[PDB]
Structures are given as C-alpha cells and as structure tokens.
Amino acid sequence: SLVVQEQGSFQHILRLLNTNVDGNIKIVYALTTIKGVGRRYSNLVCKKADVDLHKRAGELTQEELERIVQIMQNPTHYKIPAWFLNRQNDITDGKDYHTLANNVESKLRDDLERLKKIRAHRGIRHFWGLRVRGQHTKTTGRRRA
Amino acid sequence: AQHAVILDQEKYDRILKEVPTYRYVSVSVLVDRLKIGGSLARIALRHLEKEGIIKPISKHSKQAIYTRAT
Amino acid sequence: PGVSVRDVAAQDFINAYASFLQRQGKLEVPGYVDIVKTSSGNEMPPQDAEGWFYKRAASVARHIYMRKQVGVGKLNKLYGGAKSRGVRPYKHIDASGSINRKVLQALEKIGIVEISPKGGRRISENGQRDLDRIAAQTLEEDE
Amino acid sequence: AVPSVQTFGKKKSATAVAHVKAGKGLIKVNGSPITLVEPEILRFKVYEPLLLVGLDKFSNIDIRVRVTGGGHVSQVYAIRQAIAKGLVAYHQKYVDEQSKNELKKAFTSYDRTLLIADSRRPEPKKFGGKGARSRFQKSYR
Amino acid sequence: FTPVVLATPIPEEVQQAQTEIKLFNKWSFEEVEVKDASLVDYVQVRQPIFVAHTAGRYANKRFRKAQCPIIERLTNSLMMNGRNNGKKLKAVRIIKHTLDIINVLTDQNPIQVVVDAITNTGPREDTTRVGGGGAARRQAVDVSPLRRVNQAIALLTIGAREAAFRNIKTIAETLAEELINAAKGSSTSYAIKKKDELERVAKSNR
Amino acid sequence: TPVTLAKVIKVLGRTGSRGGVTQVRVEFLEDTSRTIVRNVKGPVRENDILVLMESEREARRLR
RNA sequence: UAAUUGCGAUAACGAACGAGACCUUAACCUACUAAAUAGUGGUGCUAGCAUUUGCUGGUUAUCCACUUCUUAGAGGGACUAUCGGUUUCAAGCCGAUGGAAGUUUGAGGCAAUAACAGGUCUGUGAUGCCCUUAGACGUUCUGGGCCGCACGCGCGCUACACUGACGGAGCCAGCGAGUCUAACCUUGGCCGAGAGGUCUUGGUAAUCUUGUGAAACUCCGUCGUGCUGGGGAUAGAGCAUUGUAAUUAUUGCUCUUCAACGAGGAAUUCCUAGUAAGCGCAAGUCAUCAGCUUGCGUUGAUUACGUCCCUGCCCUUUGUACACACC
C-alpha cells in the first residue's frame, strides 16, 4: 500500500536472553526462534506489548524489547490467562510458570532426573533410552494439516 | 540467506527508476534481479500502481501482473 | 472453515462494516477475545487482530440473515476448523463456540436479532436497515 | 392466469429447477444476482445460454432458478442447463416453433450438455480396493 | 455493437464481448491461423470457448480427443502430480494468467503464440525400443500428428511445471516463458531441448 | 531444416513386439503415385499429414 | 464372437448344464397413479444486507391449486434402430444419423464338470478317533501378557512446499445410523480458550438429529525460498471426557520442543472413464479409541483403444523315456 524508508538505525541479528533474534523477518517469528517461546505465545506477547506486527525485528526501541522481555518472564501478573503457560501449575511451588530461554532445557533435565530418582516406570524407560509414552514401539512421528 | 528484504535507501530509488523500463512486472520479476523481498515487492507494487507508472491488467494475490504506462 | 460467501463481495461486504461496527461504539467484546485460536482444530489467531470480531459479527449477522432461523450448535459446526490429530487427515470438528455465543449475545443487544420460536434466533425488520447497508453502499456507489 | 413454465437440469447428483414467466427481464439464482453467482472463473458458463442465442430475447421474460445437490461446478452446469431448457420450453408453449428451432440449432451446435443432460453417473465402489476399478497392492514376498 | 437494457444489471464491460462475436473473455479466436503443415485437424481454434472447462468426454471413441479444444487440453495437462489432480479451476485460472503474461510480453494474440509453440515443440521424428530378447537398440520411425500434439503439450506442461517447482516464478510465469521461447527456435526452453534430444537420438539410427 | 510432407492413404497394420508402431502407406503431393512403407509411432487414420525428415527410406516389418 | 457365441461344414443325430437369457442397481419418462412424513405456485400476514418482489423462512396451519423437481407403484423405452460401407456377400464388423442411453448401455449378484490330500476341529450343542475329567488343559476371581522392539519384510493416508501453506471471508453433497423395558442420535438456551459440563426439547424416524449447510476449493490479505513463517512430531506440564479399574500415557484439548523434506537405490503394485488420482463423509466393529475396512458422494486428469516381447490363460496340431504329471 505505502512504502517506508528508514536509515542505518536498523540493527539485524540482535540478541536477547542468551539467543540471537533473527533480523529482516517479522518480529513474531523472529522471537519464535528462542527456546521456550513458540508461535502462538509470541503472537500473544506481541499483542500485549503493542509492536506493529507488520514491522521487522531489526527495528524498534530497546525499552520496548525489554517490555516484551518483562512480559515473557512475568506473564501471570500482566493479565495472561494462566491456562496458556507451558509448565502449568508446577510440581514444587504450586504456581504457574512459563519456562524460558536455555533454562527450559535445564528444567526439562531436572524433571527427567527427578523421575529417575523417584523410580517411576517412565523414568526407567527414560534411563534405558526407550520410547517413553507406552506407545506401539516402532516410531518416528509426523505430519498433517 | 539470499536476502534483499528491507529497502535500505538507494535500492528504492533504483526501483523507482528501473520499473517503468520493464514490459512485465510481478512479485517474481521484482525478486528476479535480487531486489526487494516478497512483502515489500507486494507493497511496492501496490504503491507503483497508486502512483501512475504501471497499468494493471491484474486479478488477485499470489499472481500479480501489471504493465508499462502508454 | 465457514460458509456462504461465494456470491457477493466476500471481503468488501464484511470489511467496511467491520470498522463501522467500531464506528457505532456498540459491539460488546468478551475481554478474553483477541488472545484466542478461534477453533479447536486450528493453529493461529486472526491476522487482523484489531478487528476480526467485527468481521465475525457481520458474518453472524449474515448467518441469521441467510435463512429461517439459526442456533449455537450450528454455528459451532460451521466456523469449526476440522481437527488435525496425527495422520488423521482433517475430520470436521466444531469451533470455539463460546465466541459465536458472545457474538450472538452482542447482536441481540444492538437490536438486530432476537430469540425465536422453534428455538434459534431470527432477524428483525428494524435490524440490518442501518448495519450492513453502509458497507454494501459501496456496491451501490460503484454500481 | 399469467403464462409460465418450469423445467430442470441435472449433473452427477446436482439438480437445478427453473421457473420462467412473462415479466420484465429479471434473471437470478438460489442466493445470487446472475452477475455474481460463483466461482468467477466458471461464471461465464451461466451466461452461455443467454449469449449464444442473444440477450435481446430475454426482454419480456422473468427467469428464476433454485438448486440442490452436488458441488459447485456441477451446480453451475445444472443451472445453465435449467436456463436453456426453461427457455426452449417457454418458446415451445408461448411462442412459434420456428423460433424454438432456431434456438435449439444455436445451442445444439455448441452443446456442452446445454439442453440435454450429462449421461455419465457414478459407478459403484467394490471390495478389495479403495475405488471402483482400483485395487489394493499385493506382496508375493 | 448495439447495447441492450435488462432488469437485472449486466455490466457493459462484460456485455460487449457477449453481444459481439464469441471469444475467450478478452482474447479472440478470430484470425490465429494454423502455422505448420499437419495439425490442420489435431489443433482446434474454431469452435471457440468462453472458458477452458468444457467437462465432456473426449478419450472415449479414439480421435474425438483431437476435436477437443486445445486450450482445454493444455489445462488438463497442467492439472497433474496427485497434489494437483482435479482442481480444474486452478488450471483454467493459470491458463488465463499465462495468456495475460503472453500478452504483456511481445504483444499479439497469446493463443496464437501457444499454437506456434505447439507446432514447433512436437518432435517430427521419434524412436522406440525393439524387442530382440537380450540386447537391442532404438529403431527409427515416424510420429503421428495427434501424437506430435500430445507430446508437445505434455512436454511444455512438464517442463513448465519442473521449472516452476521450488522457484518464485508461478506456473503462469514459467509456462508463459516456455511458450514465448517455444514460439521461435529459442532452444533454452525445456520443451525444445527435449525435442532436440529426441531428434538427435533418432538421427543416431541410420 | 530439410522437411517433406506425407499424406497417409492406407494403413497396413500394427507391427513390432509391443505393437505400439504401425505400418503405413504414405504418399505426398511432391510427385503423386510414389509411395513408401513407413512405420508410424502414434495413432493414425486416413488423411493424416506426417512430417518426414527423409524421403528415401523403407520401413520394413519389425521382428 | 466377451463366449462350443453363432455362420456354416460334416459318421453322426438330436439333447442337457456352463455362457447368454434371468435378478438387482445406475441413468430417460414435463404421460398414468398420488403425496402437508416431498416439494412448487397463488391468496391473508414479512421485504430487514447484495433486493425493486435473491431466494428464503416468517406461513403446522391461512385456505386453495398443482405434481416439473422429490418419492415410490404400474408400464413404456434400445432391438445395434435408420443410412452408408465391408464380407461365401452369411454370420457378423467399421463409420455416420437420430437418440437420455449404440464399449454384450455401465456396474455387480448368480455362476458348470472335475479337482486341491488349499484354510477352518479358535463360528457352530457340526462331529469320528485320541487326550483329560476334581493340587482337571472344565467353569470362575485377582494381576499380567498378546502394544514386550530407533524395526529384518508387508499392506496402509495427509500434501515434500509458490498450481504451496496459512489469517480469515472459505465449502455444495450423498450412502447411512439412531432410546424399552431404557438410556441411543442430539436440536435448542447458559457456562467454558478448549475438550466438555449443564438445564431442557424433538425423534421408534422421507417428519427430530438432518437442507448431517463434509472436505478438497472459490476471494482477498499474510510469507516467498530460507530443516524457515508453510503446516504443528518426538518429549515435558496441565485440564477434560469414557469406564469397576487407565499405571507400560484409551482418547480429546492447551502451551513449550517444530518436524508434509530435500522427489526416495536395485526392484515392484494398481490403472483406461465419470473411472485413475485428489478429497472428505457415513456405517461395520464400539462404553471409549481408526490410520482398518465396507459403501457414499465431491473435483476430476494424461495415455492407448494395440500387441504376444516379458508374466500367464484358452483352443488346435505335433513331440514326449513325464503321469506323486517339469518343482
């Protein structure tokens, strides 16, 4: 419809939360490359900290990006429904948690550890390196719309 | 990463210049010379339609199609 | 996923209205709207974002218009995506019915639709004279 | 009291049902002005009966059709057929024969199942295969 | 060219072509001669068609396949790969787009260009593998006009398709390119390359 | 590009192992009543114009 | 000739089965019989978006009129019909004309004689002989297992990406099926992102579910060549449902891991028309679970319309040291 211009303030390949936000693409998807954030959640975040969703990730102020970061780290007290979070309800403190960055993998490992420590069957399967879901054992897993 | 996504500055001017010299224009032609990405290609096409220059014998999205001013 | 737009101005018929429903200042948003997938067998929310509910309003206005009398369950069946499970291709499956219910509850308030005998909901004589008339006035203007 | 006739058109399982009478010109369908209809690409199919003979002969008449069954293309095919048959029948009853003959010959030369229906109809599915003539794959080893 | 009034509104932009002699929407079947010797039978052009849908039965007797309109045949050819089996609407759309593209570049009737492409791209000579029963070569034979047409269409559609596949150019664009190239002896086109391959390999049997 | 015409006046029959090749009596306007037994690949009837590369040929029955 | 179908010939003559004929089904009846459990049109009550009277319902009630569509019942209809060619000029064959239908009009069902030491004693209170018969291989309760596995081989269904996948605005069907001595199919209003929960309602069914307003696909916007955004696995965390009981997760939803995958050696499966291929839908199992099948529609191609070379089948001649018959 209308063509913009802008100048050398554009900063592609910037980083946030131990990870590189990819430049020259829509901001939602750029966020999505982070461990602990996916598409829907990213979209939600964008809606919340109102960024122009047509605009690319390499633009935009640092204060704004830190608002986004704040939202991502502190979702439940910024009026996000509390059924949306990944590690919902939790098994220690008893409050909702959106695990984020490289901490999600660490947190995952911690879960996988505690299972083995507990000695639940699933834990034993994990220890053995087996198909853990109790599904019909001959798997790869795929692929429709 | 073939790129040519954001307009920069001089590449917009270049587009303004070299668009009317073409016979055929579309999203493919405006990425063919390693020019502006799909988004901008569409946007810019709509603009060039708005500001004279190219005359539409077009139809819809995906396959856009315009011609020179005559 | 949806029905009955093949004929007239699919997008333009329900776009000039969408902003006009905001122009009216009568619409009644749920609150938890616009952070929602719109269907169990879908994947993303709409790309309009600041809108969409107003499209679905005139689309439900069009639905009540469509014929005789329409319900909730029917709307669920209609706007329902069909669900993609694993291999299991795209079996037709109900919508985020709550949203449609909310839309209905809004429209009833604005004086367009009312609850009928035989259940369901029906269009009024006073109703759409003002609502989608201005959007389709673009077709009358072009003619 | 007023002169009027009614005919139909078929395609696979799609069925169109036309109503013609003496009026002012009006031609519309199911839930469509005849310009719009669907699917824009096919659209021109609905005009075929009107144009090949000439639009001048749809001045004093009032046609209106409704359909059921099938899909989009099929529906289109049905409606055009209905428009054709309805017209020729109307000519036959309320106009002289020569005009009707002229109409036929204009149509029947072009015939895309214009007057007469499409005689192909779905063959049934049979066991040991997903379709009628198709069969499942066999192993040996 | 006299207009006419009616109760329902039919636009004059559309109605013109309807009133006057019959044609594909904008582009006309008038003029557009059969260029090469042969195919004065196996290429249609008259009878004309509004759109290239015409869902009848053609491969039924034997050579009524020929009397089917060439544009429709082209559309049919474009319509394949499984993923794209059925969806004639898509095909006709892309045919229209192709025609548009061929009008934009080079001007002139795009149907005529298509005809030219057909006439050129059919490999005048073609060979086949004789039995023997162990080790045998290609034996040199002639090819039918119908078969020439069939291969022309097939080759153009296939080359256009492969060219499109995983390239920003749509089928409409790539196909158009193939056609415009195929109108003359361009040789960089896929169809004509294949034709050349078929001819040289034929010529290596005497 | 040496090209010659060929109108099919008769078709002797199917030939070859697979039988997807036909023996044909072609005849052209460049000196009428001069004929060849040519082998054709595709479907052929009476009054079909074939595009010949070479005139001097004799397509014999495939074995 | 699809056919021991015929035409003919003739130590054979008439005959029977199989084939065909027959049955169901698929299409054509603006002719008959009619139909508020199917429609359409006119009159009292609606004209609210593209509308001036789309088409729709207001309209089980407003009464009347109708049977084209829709349903059946009864019949008709196609016999290769007429014309041309072609053949001892016979059976028949190829083209043209009309025709809804002109490949035995398509599809099936039915399907001879003699066989196989095909499969089944785990369908059978169908059974012989053998085994066992009260720490019983009988019956029955508790708990597993048949899902033990990144596959060594076999079938199976979404779109490897721009004829694409999204965001919406998408999207017309047709087979069916359905509660009683009970709880099946669920319309409706409320609540719920969701799956679902609820208060009820209609239905023993052309009437209610249910025009199963299915999916692919039509229209614009969003990416646009990038193991990325295209679309949402493998693993984790929650919330629902069914069920005495779900743990080696039944299923379903939600978010985080993100995957239609780089067009698949050698090989081999199916396929000639509304078929192949695409796409859903119902039913069959069923408390719950489909990617399984059994039917149904929807969009709808290319390429022969041939041959005996490969793989086999039928007949006749011939050869044979084979006859558990070339393994």
Swiss-Prot record, chain A:
The modification N6-methyllysine is found at residue 47. GO terms for biological process: cytoplasmic translation; endonucleolytic cleavage in ITS1 to separate SSU-rRNA from 5.8S rRNA and LSU-rRNA from tricistronic rRNA transcript (SSU-rRNA, 5.8S rRNA, LSU-rRNA); ribosomal subunit export from nucleus. It comes from Saccharomyces cerevisiae (strain ATCC 204508 / S288c) (Baker's yeast). Coiled coil: none annotated. Component of the small ribosomal subunit (SSU). Mature yeast ribosomes consist of a small (40S) and a large (60S) subunit. The 40S small subunit contains 1 molecule of ribosomal RNA (18S rRNA) and 33 different proteins (encoded by 57 genes). The large 60S subunit contains 3 rRNA molecules (25S, 5.8S and 5S rRNA) and 46 different proteins (encoded by 81 genes). Keywords: Acetylation, Cytoplasm, Isopeptide bond, Methylation, Ribonucleoprotein, Ribosomal protein, RNA-binding, rRNA-binding, Ubl conjugation. PANTHER family: 30S RIBOSOMAL PROTEIN S13/40S RIBOSOMAL PROTEIN S18, SMALL RIBOSOMAL SUBUNIT PROTEIN US13. Present with 48100 molecules/cell in log phase SD medium. N-terminally acetylated by acetyltransferase NatA. Disulfide bonds: none annotated. GO terms for cellular component: cytoplasm; cytosol; cytosolic small ribosomal subunit; mitochondrion; small ribosomal subunit. This is Small ribosomal subunit protein uS13A. It is found in: Cytoplasm. It holds the Pfam family Ribosomal_S13. The lineage of its organism: Eukaryota, Fungi, Dikarya, Ascomycota, Saccharomycotina. The modification N-acetylserine is found at residue 1. Belongs to the universal ribosomal protein uS13 family. Signal peptide: none annotated.
UniProtKB/Swiss-Prot annotation, chain B:
GO terms for biological process: cytoplasmic translation. Keywords: Cytoplasm, Methylation, Ribonucleoprotein, Ribosomal protein. It is found in: Cytoplasm. Its main location: cytoplasm. The keyword GTP-binding does not apply. GO terms for cellular component: cytosol; cytosolic small ribosomal subunit. Disulfide bonds: none annotated. GO terms for molecular function: structural constituent of ribosome. The keyword NAD does not apply. It is presumed that the precursor part of S25 is engaged in assembling of the small subunit, thus being essential in ribosome maturation. Present with 322000 molecules/cell in log phase SD medium. Component of the small ribosomal subunit (SSU). Mature yeast ribosomes consist of a small (40S) and a large (60S) subunit. The 40S small subunit contains 1 molecule of ribosomal RNA (18S rRNA) and 33 different proteins (encoded by 57 genes). The large 60S subunit contains 3 rRNA molecules (25S, 5.8S and 5S rRNA) and 46 different proteins (encoded by 81 genes). Belongs to the eukaryotic ribosomal protein eS25 family. This is Small ribosomal subunit protein eS25A. The gene is RPS25A. The chain holds residues 36 to 105 of 108 of the full protein.
Curated annotation (Swiss-Prot), chain E:
Keywords: Acetylation, Cytoplasm, Isopeptide bond, Phosphoprotein, Ribonucleoprotein, Ribosomal protein, Ubl conjugation. The modification Phosphothreonine is found at residue 8. SUPFAM superfamilies: Ribosomal protein S7. Component of the ribosome, a large ribonucleoprotein complex responsible for the synthesis of proteins in the cell. The small ribosomal subunit (SSU) binds messenger RNAs (mRNAs) and translates the encoded message by selecting cognate aminoacyl-transfer RNA (tRNA) molecules. The large subunit (LSU) contains the ribosomal catalytic site termed the peptidyl transferase center (PTC), which catalyzes the formation of peptide bonds, thereby polymerizing the amino acids delivered by tRNAs into a polypeptide chain. One of its GO terms (cellular component) is 90S preribosome. There is a cross-link at residues 26, 184 (Glycyl lysine isopeptide (Lys-Gly) (interchain with G-Cter in ubiquitin)). It is found in: Cytoplasm. N-terminally acetylated by acetyltransferase NatA. One of its GO terms (biological process) is ribosomal small subunit assembly. It holds the Pfam family Ribosomal_S7. It comes from the Eukaryota. Component of the small ribosomal subunit (SSU). Mature yeast ribosomes consist of a small (40S) and a large (60S) subunit. The 40S small subunit contains 1 molecule of ribosomal RNA (18S rRNA) and 33 different proteins (encoded by 57 genes). The large 60S subunit contains 3 rRNA molecules (25S, 5.8S and 5S rRNA) and 46 different proteins (encoded by 81 genes). Belongs to the universal ribosomal protein uS7 family. This is Small ribosomal subunit protein uS7. The gene is RPS5.
From Swiss-Prot, chain F:
N-terminally acetylated by acetyltransferase NatB. Keywords: Acetylation, Cytoplasm, Ribonucleoprotein, Ribosomal protein. The keyword Ribonucleoprotein applies. SUPFAM superfamilies: Nucleic acid-binding proteins. It comes from the Eukaryota. One of its GO terms (biological process) is ribosomal small subunit assembly. GO terms for molecular function: structural constituent of ribosome. It is found in: Cytoplasm. The keyword Cytoplasm applies. InterPro entries: NA-bd_OB-fold, Ribosomal_eS28, Ribosomal_eS28_CS. GO terms for cellular component: cytosol; cytosolic small ribosomal subunit. Gene3D superfamilies: Nucleic acid-binding proteins (2.40.50.140). Component of the ribosome, a large ribonucleoprotein complex responsible for the synthesis of proteins in the cell. The small ribosomal subunit (SSU) binds messenger RNAs (mRNAs) and translates the encoded message by selecting cognate aminoacyl-transfer RNA (tRNA) molecules. The large subunit (LSU) contains the ribosomal catalytic site termed the peptidyl transferase center (PTC), which catalyzes the formation of peptide bonds, thereby polymerizing the amino acids delivered by tRNAs into a polypeptide chain. Belongs to the eukaryotic ribosomal protein eS28 family. Present with 8600 molecules/cell in log phase SD medium. There are 2 genes for eS28 in yeast. This is Small ribosomal subunit protein eS28B.
